Design a protein around this ligand. Structure first.
Ligand SMILES: [Cu+2]
Ligand code: NA
Length: 639
């Protein structure tokens, strides 16, 4: 199940309008209180008019609306189940604006919801764009609208949340398809659950930001239930998905061909391990006792060229284990890995102990010291996040998490780690005064300007429970060493949530749940628009445009020339992300130094070290003096 974020609005005084209604299937059956009766558009003898179909409610008065529920027909018949839809709100009945929510609902008879930020409205409209099975009708047994306790206008200058993207699944794993710009999401063998999988199948769903279309596909060709995996974008731009529900499998997603290819089986079965792309395009993984057994799981490395997994038994997992109370089942999970120079992999945590992993010969591990600051040694921070926001300067910000995976209080601890050469102990300091809010299961992304956006989580980690939610996101501004609260959202984002940076510079945040019958499944995502996209008036700022790119494929150390439509002050390269269970080993930012060629023509060199400029796809953003970023250009970085 799912749940709405508000309380049902009394349907007494309401007045409803339908585009069509078959007699016996009146518009009003949708608001009778009887689940046996439903509104149904014309059929048979009244003809079969195709969607869009629309349901408009006049609440007579103004309510602080935050959601809607749609119970489909409960009579065993599927006809009229709503697929694609859009939700609109109006104070007047004529001016509807942009949808506050849109997306697709799964094809079943369960109640479906639309949760969105609170907005005063007297009118609500639900547009059924499609029918779950591609037929013409639209049927609704019951429709409800929910209201918030109160309404507080977002504060100016602090970003904005919305709209809501409704999905058929809980997106507990997601990636950006670099060639298409779509967000690829997956759940498990089911849309809302992972427990009890026969393995071998995964439900995926894609959202296209340009069209707003949500497309779904069941992947069986790799014979892998991809829930709880390792995820990396290799040196070729293929997304490598490892283990999880099918503990030894590897599935490869090729963005180019929009397809899934079986990969080689790993040497060791794992679930919940992290994997990290290396300076040579190879993928290194270690740990993962969620599945495949609980024992010491040492490193192994994937070669995309030979398509083999090779064990690195001397890259030992032992030094990175946390002191988790549940033991090894959790202590080797979600390592904070970063591919670095010369085939090295840095492990920044969650264990207090940081380590250098080496991939030559049969592997090696060397101590990189303890995460600590003038305030003391940092405790284990399972599900804390770690972001490389300046790969050139080896800067990684770490924050949040808790000593144990669950039933433990989250911390506000935040640190800056500065990496040097593999093998050396990196410098670590405390980040400002730590987070404004202790959180675990939160997610984050590095933004075009080098700031880190952090959102969601709870103060005490209780998987599948929406308790102690943190609704106020924070942004860390490295130049200032200061954290800033942003406008809060209304949907709890705790365990199984995700965040990705979109090519347009906005953040996609969604998921949470995946517990079958629980009521904490969140079949949606929201978009957070950072204040760098608005001008002073609260309107969207005008964005610099990248008119020309000399090339879209460059070797490390290579130069790129661009022309813009306006003078640019800054530019950054952001590697495309992948995300699940707080882990994102693929995102990273490289600040670029620009050569002004005169005439709004500029060049920059990509760093010559492939451990900095990890191969794969990257997003190129340019910023005007105002700080407003362009939409990204996609550049492939090869060694
Ligand atoms: Cu999980
Ligand atoms: Na009804």
């Amino acid at each position: 199940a799912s749940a709405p974020i508000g309380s049902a609005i009394s349907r007494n005084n309401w007045a409803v309008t339908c585009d069509s209604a078959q007699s016996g299937n009146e518009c009003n059956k949708a608001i009778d209180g009887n689940k046996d009766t439903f509104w149904h558009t014309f059929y048979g003898a009244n003809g079969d008019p195709k969607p869009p179909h629309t349901y408009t409610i006049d609440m007579k008065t103004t309510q602080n609306v935050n959601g809607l529920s749609m119970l489909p027909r409960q009579d065993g018949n599927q006809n009229g189940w709503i697929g694609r839809h859009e939700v609109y709100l109006s104070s007047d009945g004529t001016n509807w604006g942009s949808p506050v929510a849109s997306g697709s609902w799964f094809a079943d008879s369960t109640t479906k919801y639309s949760n969105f930020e609170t907005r005063p409205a007297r009118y609500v409209r639900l547009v059924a764009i499609t029918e779950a099975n591609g037929q013409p009708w639209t049927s609704i047994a019951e429709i409800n609208v929910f209201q918030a306790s109160s309404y507080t206008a977002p504060q100016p200058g602090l970003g904005r949340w919305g709209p809501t993207i409704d999905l058929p699944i809980v997106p507990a794993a997601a990636a950006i398809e670099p060639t298409s710009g779509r967000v690829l999401m997956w759940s498990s063998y089911r849309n809302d659950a992972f427990g009890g999988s026969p393995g071998g199948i995964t439900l995926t769903s894609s959202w296209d930001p340009s069209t707003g279309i949500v497309s779904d596909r069941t992947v069986t060709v790799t014979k892998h239930d991809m829930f709880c995996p390792g995820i990396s974008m290799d040196g070729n731009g293929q997304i490598v998905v490892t283990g999880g529900n099918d503990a030894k499998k590897t599935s490869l997603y090729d963005s180019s061909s929009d397809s899934w290819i079986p990969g080689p089986d790993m040497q060791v079965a794992r679930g919940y391990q992290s994997s990290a792309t290396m300076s040579d395009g190879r993928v290194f993984t270690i740990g993962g006792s969620w599945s495949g057994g609980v024992f010491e799981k040492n490193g192994e490395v994937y070669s995309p060229s030979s398509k083999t997994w090779t064990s690195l038994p001397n890259a030992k997992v032992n030094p990175m284990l946390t002191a988790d109370k549940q033991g090894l089942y959790r202590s080797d999970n979600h390592a904070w890995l970063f591919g670095w120079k010369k085939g090295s992999v840095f492990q920044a945590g969650p264990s207090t102990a940081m380590n250098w992993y080496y991939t030559s010969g049969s592997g090696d591990v060397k101590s990189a010291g303890k995460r600590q600051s003038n305030r003391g040694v940092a405790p284990d921070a399972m599900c804390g996040n770690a972001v490389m926001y300046d790969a050139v300067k080896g800067k990684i910000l770490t924050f949040g998490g808790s000593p144990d995976y669950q039933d433990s209080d989250a911390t506000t601890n935040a640190h800056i780690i500065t990496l040097g050469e593999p093998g050396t102990s990196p410098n670590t300091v405390f980040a400002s005064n730590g987070l404004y809010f202790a959180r675990t299961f939160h997610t984050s992304v590095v933004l075009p300007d080098g700031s880190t956006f952090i959102t969601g989580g709870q103060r005490r980690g209780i998987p599948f429970e929406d308790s102690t939610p943190v609704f106020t996101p924070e942004i860390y501004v490295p130049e200032q060493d200061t954290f800033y609260k942003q406008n809060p959202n209304s949907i709890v984002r705790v365990y199984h949530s995700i965040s990705l940076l979109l090519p347009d510079g906005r953040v996609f945040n969604g998921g949470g749940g995946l517990c079958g019958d629980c009521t904490t499944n969140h079949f949606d995502a929201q978009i957070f628009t950072p204040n760098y996209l608005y001008n002073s008036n609260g309107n969207l700022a005008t964005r610099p445009k990248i008119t020309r790119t000399s090339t879209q494929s460059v070797k490390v150390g290579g130069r790129i020339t661009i022309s813009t439509d306006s003078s640019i002050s800054k530019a950054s390269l952001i590697r495309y992300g992948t995300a699940t269970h707080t882990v994102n080993t693929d995102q990273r930012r490289i600040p670029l130094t620009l050569t002004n060629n005169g005439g709004n023509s500029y060049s920059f060199q990509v760093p010559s070290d492939s451990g900095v400029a990890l191969p794969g796809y990257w997003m190129l953003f340019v910023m005007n003096s105002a700080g407003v970023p362009s939409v990204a250009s996609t550049i492939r970085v090869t060694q």
